[PDB]
Design a protein around this ligand. Sequence first.
Ligand SMILES: *[C@@H]1O[C@H](CO)[C@@H](O[C@@H]2O[C@H](CO)[C@@H](O)[C@H](O)[C@H]2NC(C)=O)[C@H](O)[C@H]1NC(C)=O
Lengths: 132, 274, 15
Amino acid sequence: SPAWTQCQQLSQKLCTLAWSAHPLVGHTNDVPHIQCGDGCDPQGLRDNSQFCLQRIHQGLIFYEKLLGSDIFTGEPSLLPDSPVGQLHASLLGLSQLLQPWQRLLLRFKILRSLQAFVAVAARVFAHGAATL
Amino acid sequence: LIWELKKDVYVVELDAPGEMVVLTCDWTLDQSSEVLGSGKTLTIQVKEFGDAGQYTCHHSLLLLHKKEDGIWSTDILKDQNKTFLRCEAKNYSGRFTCWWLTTISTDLTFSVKSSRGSSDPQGVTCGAATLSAERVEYEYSVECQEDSACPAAEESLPIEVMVDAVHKLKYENYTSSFFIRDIIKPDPPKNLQLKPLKNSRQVEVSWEYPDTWSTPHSYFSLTFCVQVQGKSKKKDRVFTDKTSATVICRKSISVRAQDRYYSSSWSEWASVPC
Amino acid sequence: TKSFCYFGTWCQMYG
Ligand SMILES: *[C@@H]1O[C@H](CO)[C@@H](O[C@@H]2O[C@H](CO)[C@@H](O)[C@H](O)[C@H]2NC(C)=O)[C@H](O)[C@H]1NC(C)=O
């Protein structure tokens, strides 16, 4: 099975990194979500965790490609001291362990969405470490 | 135009020119015996609240959805910007509560409907809106539950809350959109104990997860903030995933909770004096 | 927008 605690440590770090990249509280789905039937719930994890992890991997690869795209590598350019840079590296790191300007509004949408995805994945790996 | 709200109840939308309304009998208004018209149907020019009410042939309620300067009326509910509905969830069960405020005491009716998504909406069952508090201002509250909830999933369609507000002959409606995860506020930590350590100022603080919080805790984890604070306003905060911490007691300890993996709302503080 | 410590896990690690 995967390195549960290393995934636990990394997925948790993704949560704090996704937070710092967008520390904003409040309130056409073109990203993969960890849906109800992707088997990432406590029961689905015991029964068959490989299914859940193949979904986490799909989503991780997806956000890597979004973060390395013109949305983030375009005007207005990111600061060098950016959490988004760290965040891109971390998504790649976890996926490897598994095996009015338009661009501004898009970053917010993707990072807010990313925050929801990484929170479920972080919970998966924390439970996995504690029970597998 | 006009539309049905409930059987024999109609909403007349208006912006004095007035809207012509044709009332078909299956005529007098409210209490009065004064006959206002002859014929199976009745043409009324609805321009004001006086031209509204229960019209009866020899049986039919008309409520108004007024519009001043091209913007629907929002008088019934007071703004808690343009936030008339406030919603919260204690966990990820699909169960939530919504609250609103008013200055009105009587002849008030609230209908509450909810769903997940707008196109092919998934069922959410709401209960009755009931008066829950009075302050020196009336507070009403409703409890909704997602029919086929999935606590662990990453929500992509928001829950939609719709509240019909009727004060006498004034009709208004309110709406709220949210993901459960965005309206999460855990209950406070429970059984907050303090253990003084022999010949020392440090105490072992211990508490438990709240009873209403999502299970298992090993999956739905919380982060706790342990705080030591004196009488007058330093900040002595510690953050932990453990259900205990050791702190320095002088001559108050507070603990609050937030979801460990997503920055939702902080809980109310649980406290114990030093 | 909030302070980074607003997210307790962030504060636990980086505060
Ligand atoms: C909230 O109020 C609006 C405005 O009165 C309602 O919109 C009308 O609804 C009827 C029935 O669905 C339609 O035939 C009309 O075309 C709508 N009017 C406009 C101006 O579009 C709306 O239905 C209400 N919402 C709820 C939850 O009842």
